[PDB]
């Protein structure tokens, strides 16, 4: 079937606070498989997040 087609472009980001663990005093982010995790906190620290 091809009689119509709808636009299906990317997802935006999504939340996953299962990532933000704790490094025994600091909040610790991780990554799925090397995916692109977009990161900073209300305080001043790493401001974009394109990381492991």
């Amino acid at each position, epitope marked *: 079937d091809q009689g119509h087609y709808v636009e299906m472009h990317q997802p935006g980001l999504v939340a996953d606070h299962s990532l933000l663990s704790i*490094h025994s005093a600091k909040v610790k982010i991780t990554v799925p498989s090397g995916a692109q995790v977009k990161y900073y906190c209300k305080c*001043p620290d790493v401001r974009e997040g394109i990381t492991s």
Partner: nanobody
Amino acid sequence: QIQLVQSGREVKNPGETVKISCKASGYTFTEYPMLWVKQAPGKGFRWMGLIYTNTGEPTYAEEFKGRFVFSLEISASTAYLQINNLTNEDTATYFCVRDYFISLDYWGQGTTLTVSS
């Protein structure tokens, strides 16, 4: 491999300022920030704060927000501690330290200040 070599020990009369250097060797400065610790003569070890050697933002321990100022000669792999308006009870030894492995892995030699007229 990793060597953090610190400046030598100073004497300063109350009121003065001091800049203690920490020259880093063996790692890429930029991926590991610096811990500044005060081991006071009797009292034991205390965290003074941490500096993001990437952005340059310092965190101060509340005990140290004020007269203490962290900075870095990025370019030369140096981190520095500056204690302004020296108080007599600041005599102690200050260590720079590398934060890595969910803690601190390397400590410097120490720079001892003796505030004294």
